[PDB]
Amino acid sequence: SLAHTAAEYMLSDLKGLRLELPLDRIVKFVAVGSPLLLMSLAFAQEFSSGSPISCFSPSNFSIRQAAYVDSSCWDSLLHHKQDQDKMKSLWPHKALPYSLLALALLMYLPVLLWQYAAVPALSSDLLFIISELDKSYNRSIRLVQHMLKIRQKSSDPYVFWNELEKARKERYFEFPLLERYLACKQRSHSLVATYLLRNSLLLIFTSATYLYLGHFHLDVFFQEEFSCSIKTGLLSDETHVPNLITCRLTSLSIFQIVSLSSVAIYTILVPVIIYNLTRLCRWDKRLLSVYEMLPAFDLLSRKMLGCPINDLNVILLFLRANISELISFSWLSVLCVLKDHNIDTVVDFMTLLAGLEP
Amino acid sequence: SLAHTAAEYMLSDLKGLRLELPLDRIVKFVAVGSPLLLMSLAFAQEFSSGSPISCFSPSNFSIRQAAYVDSSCWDSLLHHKQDQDKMKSLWPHKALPYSLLALALLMYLPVLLWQYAAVPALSSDLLFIISELDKSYNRSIRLVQHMLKIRQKSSDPYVFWNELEKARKERYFEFPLLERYLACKQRSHSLVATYLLRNSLLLIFTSATYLYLGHFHLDVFFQEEFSCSIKTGLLSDETHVPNLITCRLTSLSIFQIVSLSSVAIYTILVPVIIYNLTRLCRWDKRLLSVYEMLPAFDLLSRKMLGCPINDLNVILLFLRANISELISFSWLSVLCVLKDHNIDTVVDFMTLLAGLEP
Amino acid sequence: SLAHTAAEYMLSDLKGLRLELPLDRIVKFVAVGSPLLLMSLAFAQEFSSGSPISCFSPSNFSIRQAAYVDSSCWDSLLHHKQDQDKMKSLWPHKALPYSLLALALLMYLPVLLWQYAAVPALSSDLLFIISELDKSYNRSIRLVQHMLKIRQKSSDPYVFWNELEKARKERYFEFPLLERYLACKQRSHSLVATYLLRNSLLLIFTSATYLYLGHFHLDVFFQEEFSCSIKTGLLSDETHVPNLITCRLTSLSIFQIVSLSSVAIYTILVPVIIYNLTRLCRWDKRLLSVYEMLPAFDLLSRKMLGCPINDLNVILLFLRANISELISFSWLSVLCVLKDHNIDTVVDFMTLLAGLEP
Amino acid sequence: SLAHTAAEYMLSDLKGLRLELPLDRIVKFVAVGSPLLLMSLAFAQEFSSGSPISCFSPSNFSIRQAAYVDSSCWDSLLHHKQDQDKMKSLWPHKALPYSLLALALLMYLPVLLWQYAAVPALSSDLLFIISELDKSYNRSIRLVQHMLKIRQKSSDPYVFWNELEKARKERYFEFPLLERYLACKQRSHSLVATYLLRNSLLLIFTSATYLYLGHFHLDVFFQEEFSCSIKTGLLSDETHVPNLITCRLTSLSIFQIVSLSSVAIYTILVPVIIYNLTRLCRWDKRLLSVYEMLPAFDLLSRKMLGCPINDLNVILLFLRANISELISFSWLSVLCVLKDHNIDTVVDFMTLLAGLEP
Amino acid sequence: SLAHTAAEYMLSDLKGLRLELPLDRIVKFVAVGSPLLLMSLAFAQEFSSGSPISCFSPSNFSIRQAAYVDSSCWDSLLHHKQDQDKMKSLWPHKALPYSLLALALLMYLPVLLWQYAAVPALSSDLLFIISELDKSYNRSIRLVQHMLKIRQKSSDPYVFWNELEKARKERYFEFPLLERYLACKQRSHSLVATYLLRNSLLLIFTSATYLYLGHFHLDVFFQEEFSCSIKTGLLSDETHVPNLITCRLTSLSIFQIVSLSSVAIYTILVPVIIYNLTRLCRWDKRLLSVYEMLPAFDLLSRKMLGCPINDLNVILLFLRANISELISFSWLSVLCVLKDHNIDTVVDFMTLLAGLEP
C-alpha cells in the first residue's frame, strides 16, 4: 500500500552530533506514522471490505442493473429523508482516506522547517564549539601533567593554587574569542523562533484535527442506513422504484474505530509537546555546582541570568545531549562522587588527578 | 500481512557491552512475537476464512439480495433472542485482530522505557568499572611476584606473615576512586526502579489480558448460531422474513484455539518474571571466596551489607555477564581449580604465574 | 504503478560541491513528483474503480450484450443531447492520466536544460574562484603577522595608519590576477539570462496548466450522466432501444478532487518562483563588512557596481551555499556579531590569532 | 507460506570453533525441517485443495444455501451415525497443520537448552585447552632435539635409557596447571547432564509422537464419508432434510501419506539418538598410543580410568573434533605412519624433526 | 514452487583445493536437477492444468453437485470395469509429483555421504602432499645446477655418469618421510570404499527407477477413460446413475512425456558412472616419463605396482586435477616439449634453468 511506501520514504531513521531530542523523535514517529498505520489497517489486510456500499435492489433487476444501482450511489451519497427534502451528505465516508493522508502529510511540515531553517547554522557553529573545546583538555594533557611533579616535592597551597592560576588565567590557557561568541548568542533571538514555531504548528494542527472531527464526524456516527434516489435525471421517465431504499454502509465499524483511535492518540500526545515547550521557560541548574569550577565550563555557568528565552538556552540544551559522545564521556560523567572551605578544595583536585586518563 | 513487517521492524535482534540479560531477551521475544504469529496464522496461510459469517437466506432471494443480507449482519452482530429482548452482542469475534495487535503493541512499551531511561547511565557505569578492573592483572602478579621469590630466602613470620601488610596496604595496591565510586553508587536507588517497573508492567499487562479473556471471552465460546434481524429500520415496511434466523459463525474453532493458546503461553510465562524480580532479593555469594584475595575484586565483595535493593546489586549482576568478554575471559575464568592457613595462600600464588599471559 | 518507477528513476536523491539551491530543489520536487502522486492515488490503491462507466441496459439483454453495451460507450464518449444534435465530448475523463503523465514529464525539461547548459561552464569558474579565494592563510596571517608586534614599539596612528599604505599596496598582498578574471567575467551577458529562461519555462508551463484546466475542465464538472447511442452504425437495422440512455460516470469525485488539487498546489507554488527570480535583482551586502577587511575576499565586495544582471551574481549566489562548506566559512563564521577608528583596527586582530587552528 | 519463513528464521546454518557434532547437526536438521516440509507440501503448491470438504446438497437449494451447507459442516465435524447416537468427531483432519506446527516448535526446545546451558562453559574450557596445547610443539622438538644429537656421541644406557628420565622430569616439560585443571574437571558432572537431557528430550518427544499417531490417528484412517446434521438448532423448525448425508473428505490421501511419512521418518531416526547416547558409555582409545609420547598429550591419556560418565569424556570428544583446525591440523595428523624397545623410540624422533614446520 | 527453493538450497555451486572431479559434479547436477525441472515444468508455468480430472455428469445435476462429482473421484481413482469387479487403480497419476520428489531426494544421499565420510581425510592428505611437493623446485635446479657448469670443465664418465650417483644419493636430495607416508597409504583401503559406494548407490537407484517405471507405469499408459462408481456407501439409497461413467484424465500427455524423458535421461546417464568406476581399475602413467626424473615426483612414479585398488590411486587422481593451481601451474605444465642416452639428459637439464622463474 501507499502507507508502507510513505513510511519508508517519509519518517525514516556532523558525523556524530545528535541534532534532535529523543522526545521530539518519539513525538515525530507517533504523530506521522500513526495515520499511515491506521490507513494500512483500514483499507486492506484484516478487513477486506470489498464493496463499501450494498443495496436492497428489487428482485426484478438484473445483475448488471444491480451493479449500476449500487455503483451510482457511492459517488452520490445523499440521505433523501422524507422530512424541505434535506439531503444530508455522508461525504466523510468517501473522504476518510483523503483526510488521513492529508493529516499525515501535514504532520511533516514542522520537521521540514526545523531541518531546513535551523539545522545548518546550528550544525556549523556547534562544530566550531566542539572543535575548540577539545584543546582545552589538550592544555591539561600538556601543562598540568607535570603539575603534580613540580608540586610533589614541596607542599602547601602556594604550590597548588597560584602555580596554575596564572597558567589557567593566561595567554596560553584562554579562549576569549568564545567569551564574545556566547555573550552575543545570548542576545540573538533567531534560533528560538524555529523551536517555538515547530511546537506551535503541531499544536494548531492537533486543534485542527479536533475541530474537523467535531464538525463532520460525530454527526453521521450511529447512522448506517439511508434512502437514496435514482430517478433524479435521465432516469425520471422510467417505470421502476422512485426511491432506492435502505442502502447500508458496510464499513461503519472501521469508521467509528478509526475516529476513536485518532481522538485517543492525539489526546495522549498533547502533554508531551507542552512539556517540551515549557522545557525552555526555565534556566536549568541541575549540575551547575561543578560547572562553576571547571575552567572552560565556568563561562557556561556565569552567563546564567536574565530572561530564559535566548539562543544560549537551545545551545546548552543540545550540548547536554551531546556532552557524552566519547571524550567528554569521561571524568565529566565520572564526577558523581563530588556531589554531597579548605578541605573540599584539595579533595576535589586529587580526584581530578586520580582520573589521569592515560 | 502486518505481522511480518511488525516482526521485522519491531523485535529485531558501547560496541561490545551486553546490555540485556539472556532470560530477558527470551521472555521479551516470546511475549512480543507470539500474538503476531497467532494473528498471522489465524487470518491467513492455512485457513482461508473468506467470509467469517454465513447465512441461510430463503430461496426467493436473489444473489445480490443474499450479499446484502450477509453483509448487513457482519457489522451488526446482535442476537435477537426471544427471551425483554436482551440483544446480546458478539463483538469480540470481529475485534479479535484489533485485540491481538493492541496486545502486541502494549507488550513492547517496557523494553522501550528500559532502553531509554536506563541504557546510557548504565552503559557509562559499566564502561568505567570495566576500564579500571582491566588494570587489576598487573597489580597482583606485577606487584606481588617478589613474594615467593622472597619466601624461599626466609622462613615464616617476616616473609609470609609480616609482608602481607606492608605490600597490601601500599599505594600501588589501593584504588581510592573506585571505592568512593562504589560508596556513592550503592546509596543511589534510581537505576533499580526501572527494573522493578519494567517487570511490574509485564505482570500488570498479563493480569489485564487475563481480565479481558475472563470477562469478554468465556461467554461467547460455545455459541455458533445466532438469529439476526434486518427490518429494524426503514425495511420494516417490506414483505419478507421478520427474523432471519441462522447466521452461523465460520471461525469458531480459530477463536477457541487462539484464546486457549493466549491463555496457556502467558500462564507458562508468568513465573520467569517473578523469578527475575526475586533474583534481586538476595546478595549473590557464589564465588566471593576468590574475589576477596584480588586487589580490585576485594572491593566488590567488601561493600556487600544491608538491604540488597541498591544500584550496586544491578550493576554487579550486569557486570557478571560481561566478566567473560575477552580479557577477563581469562585467568579469572581459569581460576576454577581454587574452590576446594599458610599453604593455601602460597598455592594460590604460583597458580597465578602459571597463567602469566605473555 | 508506473508512477513509482518514474519517481524511482527520475527525481531520485565535484565530490563536495553543492550545485543546487535547496529551495530550487524543493520547488523541483513539489513540481515534478506531485502529478505522479495524484495519478498513483487516483487509479489504484484505495479506490478500486473497476469500470469507470456503468449502463442501465434493459432486462432483456444477456450478460455479454451488456458487456458490449458498457464497453462500446467508454471509448465513444458522446452525449447525444436532445438540444442541431450537439454531441458534446467527454474525453477529458479518459485523457486525465495522459495529461498527468505529460505534465510530469514536461516539468523535468527545465531541470535537464539547466543541468546541461549551465553546470558545465559554471563548475570550473566556481572551483577556480574557491581555489584562489581560500588563500588567505599564507596571505593574511603570514603577511599581516608583523602588525601586532610592530604596534607596541611605536604609538597608534604612525604604526597602524602608515604601514597599511605599503603592506597592502605590495605585490604579495595584491590580487590583480583574480582582478582581470573577475573584470572580464562581468562583460559577459550570454549566461546571465539562462536562469531567467529556466524560470520562465516553468512559468509558461504553469500558465499552460491554468489554461488547460480552465478551458476543458470546469465545463464537465457537475455532469455525471449522459445518453449514448448504439444504433449509430451497422446496428441501425435492429429492433432495440435507439437512445440507450443513462450512462453514469462513477469516478466523477476522483476527477473533481484531482483537478482541485492540481489547481491549488500550483497556486501555492507560483509566488516562490517569482521570489527566486527577484533574488537575482539586487546586490547582496548582508556580510560585506567582513569581506572587505580580508585580502582575498576584498575583491568580491569591491566589484559590486552597475546593473545587477551579471554572471558574477550567479557565481556569488551559487557560491554562498558552497562558500560555507568547510574552510572559508570558519574564518567568516568567527565574527558574526562583529558589526559594531583606532581600537577597531586592533580588536579584530587578536580575534584572528585567537583561532590559529593549530 | 509460514513454513518457509519458519525454516528461514530457525534451523539456519569463538570465531572458528566447532561447537556442534556433525551427526547432531544432521539429526537436528532431519528432526526439525521434516514436519515443515510435510506442511509445505500438504497444504500448498501442487494440490490446491480449495475446500477440504464437499457436500451433496439437494437440487432445490440455491448457491448461497449450498455455501451455508458446506460451511456449517467443516467446523462441526461430527459423524451422525445411526448406531446412543455416538457422535464420533473427525477433528484430526482439521488439527493436522496445528499438530505439525506444534511438533515443530516442540522438537527445537532441546537445541535451545544445549545452546543456553552448556555452550559458554564448554567454550571456555576448550579455549583454555587448545591455548595450552599449541605450545606443546616447541617442547618436544625445540627442547628434546638434543637427544639424537647426543645419541651418536655415546652408546645405549646413559645416552638413551638414562637421559629420558632427567629430561622428562624437568620444569620445562611439566604442565601442572593442566594436570590440576583436568583433575578438578573430571570430578564435575554438570556438562554431561545437558547432553543427556538433550538426547532424552528427543526420545520422549518421539515417543509422544508415536502415542499421538497411535491413538487419534489409525482410527479415522479409512473413513471418507460421514452424514452430517444441520437441524440441531434454530433450523429444527424447518422443512428440509433432517440428516444431510454424505459429506466427503477431499484430502484423505494427503492425510494418510502425511501420517505414514511422519511415522516412518522418526522410526528411521530412532537408532541414531541411542547411538549418540551410548557413545558416552565407553572410553575412546583409538589413537591413545601416539598421545602418550607427546608431553602435553600424555596427561590426556593418563587420566583414563574409572566410570566414563564425566565432563572429561565430553571435553575430549569435542576436543577431537577441533584437533584439526589450522595448527594441530599438522604433524599430529601427519603422525599416522607411526601406527604399525630401542629402535622404536628413536625412529619416532627424526620423524618429528623432519616435520620441523618452518 | 518448492522446485525452485529445493534447487536453491541443495545443488548449489582448503581455500583453493578442488575436492570434486568435475565429471562427478556435472553428473550429480544432471541426476539431481532433472526431477526438479520435470516437476516445475509439469505442474506449473506453461500447462495451467486447473483440475486434473473432468466428469460427465447428467444435465439434471446442480453446479455444486457437479463439483462433488468431480472431487469424489480424484481421491478415489478406481476403474470399475464390467469385466470379478477388478477395481484397477490409477494411483501413479496422483503420485507422480510424490515420486519425482522422492527420487530427487534419493539422488542426494551419495553426495552427502561423500561430503561427510571422505572429505576431511582426503583434504588432509592432499594438503600434506602439496605442502611437501612444493619444495621440489629448489631441489633439482638450486641443487643440481652445478652439473653442466662442471660438465663443460670435464669430459664424460666422472662428470656426467659418475657424479649422477654421489649427488642423487645425498641427504638434501632425499624425501624419506614422503616415501614412508606413501607406503603407509598404499596398504589402506578406506577411501576407495567411499568412492565405490558413491557409484554403486547411484547404479542401484537407477535400477530401482527402471523397476518402478516397469511395474506401475507402462500399464496405464494408453488409458484415459474410466467409469467410476459413486453409490459405494451412504449414497446407495438415492435416485441417480449407478455407474457414473467417463471421468476423463486431462493430464495424460504430461504423464507420458515425463515418463519418456525420465527414462531417456537416465539411459543416457548410465555409461558415465560405469566409466568413472572403471577409471580406478588401472594405473595412469600418461606422463610418468617426466615424473621419474624429478626428485620428489620420482617417488610417486615408483609406487605403481600390484592391484590398482589402493588409496594412493584416488590420491593421485585427485592430485592430477589440482597440480595446476598457482605454483605447480608452472614449468611442470611447461614440460610438454620434453616428450619425444647421453645428450637427452643434458637437454633435459638446461631447460630447467631456462625456466628459472625468477
XYZ file of N, CA and C in Angstrom, chain A residues 1-2 5 9 39 43 50 60-65 67-69 71-73 75-76 94 97-98 101 116 124-125 128 177 180-181 184-185 187 232 234-235 238 240, chain C residues 4 8 22-23 26 40-41 45-48 54-59 63 66 70 79 225-227 245-246 248-251 253-254 257 329 334 336-337 351 354-355:
240
model
N 0.824 -1.202 0.000
C 0.000 0.000 0.000
C 0.862 1.257 0.000
N 0.245 2.397 -0.319
C 0.954 3.670 -0.283
C 1.426 4.036 1.116
N 4.975 2.636 1.567
C 5.945 3.418 0.806
C 6.189 4.777 1.448
N 9.758 6.113 2.784
C 10.363 7.352 2.310
C 10.363 8.402 3.415
N -4.434 4.001 8.154
C -4.787 3.778 6.756
C -4.498 2.343 6.341
N -7.985 -0.043 5.102
C -8.372 -0.295 3.718
C -7.636 -1.482 3.104
N -14.275 -5.009 0.355
C -14.871 -5.342 -0.922
C -15.650 -4.173 -1.485
N -36.706 -7.970 -9.515
C -36.841 -7.951 -10.969
C -35.581 -7.436 -11.655
N -34.696 -6.774 -10.915
C -33.490 -6.217 -11.510
C -32.520 -7.318 -11.923
N -31.743 -7.032 -12.964
C -30.691 -7.930 -13.408
C -29.414 -7.673 -12.611
N -28.420 -8.543 -12.802
C -27.155 -8.388 -12.091
C -26.455 -7.102 -12.514
N -26.409 -6.830 -13.820
C -25.820 -5.580 -14.292
C -26.626 -4.376 -13.821
N -27.954 -4.503 -13.788
C -28.778 -3.418 -13.268
C -28.473 -3.154 -11.800
N -25.661 -3.809 -10.318
C -24.331 -3.211 -10.287
C -24.398 -1.717 -10.574
N -25.193 -1.323 -11.569
C -25.399 0.099 -11.822
C -26.016 0.784 -10.612
N -26.996 0.135 -9.984
C -27.709 0.750 -8.869
C -26.772 0.987 -7.689
N -23.512 1.105 -7.792
C -22.366 1.932 -8.144
C -22.742 3.390 -8.369
N -24.019 3.677 -8.607
C -24.480 5.038 -8.835
C -24.781 5.793 -7.548
N -24.641 5.150 -6.388
C -24.957 5.785 -5.119
C -23.738 6.083 -4.260
N -20.927 7.386 -5.279
C -20.481 8.706 -5.701
C -21.547 9.775 -5.505
N -22.726 9.397 -5.021
C -23.850 10.303 -4.814
C -24.466 10.071 -3.442
N -16.648 8.738 2.203
C -15.852 8.592 0.991
C -14.557 9.392 1.047
N -10.005 8.287 3.740
C -8.588 8.139 3.366
C -7.952 9.447 2.933
N -8.711 10.306 2.245
C -8.198 11.618 1.863
C -7.794 12.421 3.091
N -4.606 10.882 4.794
C -3.350 11.162 4.102
C -2.998 12.644 4.173
N 15.353 22.538 7.661
C 15.808 23.454 6.623
C 16.285 24.800 7.149
N 26.963 24.091 11.958
C 28.285 24.647 11.684
C 28.929 25.211 12.948
N 28.202 26.060 13.672
C 28.831 26.690 14.822
C 28.987 25.721 15.996
N 32.026 24.251 15.505
C 33.072 25.153 15.992
C 33.315 24.983 17.495
N 37.824 34.505 22.614
C 37.001 34.653 21.419
C 35.639 34.000 21.622
N 33.125 36.358 23.780
C 32.316 37.240 22.945
C 31.256 36.450 22.185
N 31.616 35.249 21.724
C 30.680 34.403 20.989
C 29.430 34.100 21.809
N 27.310 37.140 22.681
C 26.482 37.669 21.605
C 25.324 36.734 21.274
N 25.554 35.416 21.292
C 24.428 34.495 21.144
C 23.462 34.559 22.320
N 22.315 37.378 23.079
C 21.465 38.486 22.658
C 20.550 38.101 21.501
N -33.503 10.876 -10.570
C -33.164 12.280 -10.376
C -32.385 12.789 -11.590
N -31.966 11.650 -16.066
C -32.423 10.964 -17.268
C -33.276 9.739 -16.966
N -33.202 9.192 -15.754
C -33.976 8.015 -15.383
C -35.374 8.354 -14.887
N -39.113 6.498 -16.213
C -38.995 5.049 -16.197
C -39.945 4.486 -15.149
N -40.033 2.205 -12.535
C -39.357 1.428 -11.503
C -39.484 2.179 -10.184
N 5.458 4.908 -9.610
C 6.510 4.534 -8.670
C 7.844 4.363 -9.386
N 11.196 6.564 -8.979
C 12.453 5.915 -8.625
C 13.575 6.318 -9.574
N 18.814 24.670 -2.205
C 17.813 23.813 -1.547
C 16.384 24.225 -1.851
N 16.122 25.531 -1.940
C 14.788 25.992 -2.304
C 14.425 25.551 -3.716
N 13.516 21.926 -3.583
C 12.166 21.710 -3.068
C 11.127 22.051 -4.129
N -1.023 8.135 -9.110
C -0.966 6.882 -8.365
C -2.141 6.756 -7.405
N -2.499 7.851 -6.731
C -3.630 7.823 -5.811
C -4.943 7.589 -6.548
N -4.761 1.516 -5.636
C -4.708 1.538 -4.179
C -6.084 1.627 -3.529
N -6.391 2.792 -2.957
C -7.564 2.937 -2.101
C -8.862 2.726 -2.875
N -8.932 3.234 -4.104
C -10.178 3.234 -4.869
C -10.060 2.239 -6.016
N -10.569 1.031 -5.790
C -10.669 0.023 -6.842
C -11.850 0.399 -7.726
N -20.916 2.854 -16.136
C -21.963 1.867 -15.918
C -23.145 2.192 -16.819
N -23.903 1.164 -17.189
C -25.009 1.313 -18.121
C -26.255 0.646 -17.561
N -27.399 1.310 -17.731
C -28.691 0.757 -17.328
C -29.370 0.166 -18.560
N -28.873 -0.991 -18.979
C -29.448 -1.706 -20.103
C -30.788 -2.325 -19.717
N -31.674 -2.537 -20.690
C -32.942 -3.211 -20.391
C -32.710 -4.643 -19.931
N -33.690 -5.175 -19.196
C -33.556 -6.504 -18.612
C -33.550 -7.612 -19.658
N -25.772 -11.198 -20.486
C -24.582 -10.657 -19.836
C -23.607 -10.098 -20.866
N -24.743 -6.835 -22.394
C -24.481 -5.693 -21.523
C -22.994 -5.361 -21.479
N -21.571 -1.621 -22.195
C -20.727 -0.758 -21.378
C -19.280 -0.722 -21.856
N -22.235 12.715 -25.699
C -23.536 12.959 -25.084
C -24.528 13.336 -26.178
N -24.133 12.130 -15.761
C -24.974 11.227 -16.533
C -25.056 11.730 -17.965
N -25.248 10.807 -18.904
C -25.396 11.151 -20.309
C -26.043 9.987 -21.044
N -26.661 10.299 -22.178
C -27.332 9.316 -23.015
C -26.486 9.043 -24.249
N -30.093 5.309 -22.974
C -29.855 6.412 -22.052
C -29.182 5.927 -20.771
N -28.786 6.900 -19.950
C -28.347 6.707 -18.566
C -27.037 5.918 -18.479
N -23.728 6.462 -16.505
C -23.329 7.214 -15.322
C -21.826 7.101 -15.107
N -21.169 8.247 -14.938
C -19.737 8.289 -14.656
C -19.525 8.075 -13.162
N -18.972 6.919 -12.796
C -18.814 6.584 -11.385
C -17.639 7.306 -10.736
N -16.642 7.718 -11.518
C -15.409 8.296 -10.983
C -15.380 9.815 -11.099
N -15.977 11.948 -8.645
C -15.361 12.509 -7.447
C -13.844 12.552 -7.570
N -13.235 11.453 -8.021
C -11.787 11.437 -8.194
C -11.365 12.547 -9.144
N -11.601 16.061 -7.204
C -10.524 16.305 -6.241
C -9.163 16.407 -6.928
N 34.252 29.243 5.464
C 33.230 29.640 6.427
C 33.826 29.850 7.812
N 33.648 33.172 12.488
C 34.161 33.769 13.715
C 34.241 35.283 13.551
N 30.618 37.186 12.947
C 29.159 37.204 13.021
C 28.602 38.467 13.664
N 28.680 38.542 14.994
C 28.141 39.691 15.712
C 28.962 40.943 15.436
N 41.391 38.476 17.597
C 40.376 37.505 17.210
C 40.875 36.595 16.096
N 43.322 34.399 17.711
C 42.695 33.500 18.672
C 42.374 32.154 18.041
N 41.824 32.160 16.829
C 41.582 30.941 16.086
C 42.709 30.604 15.131
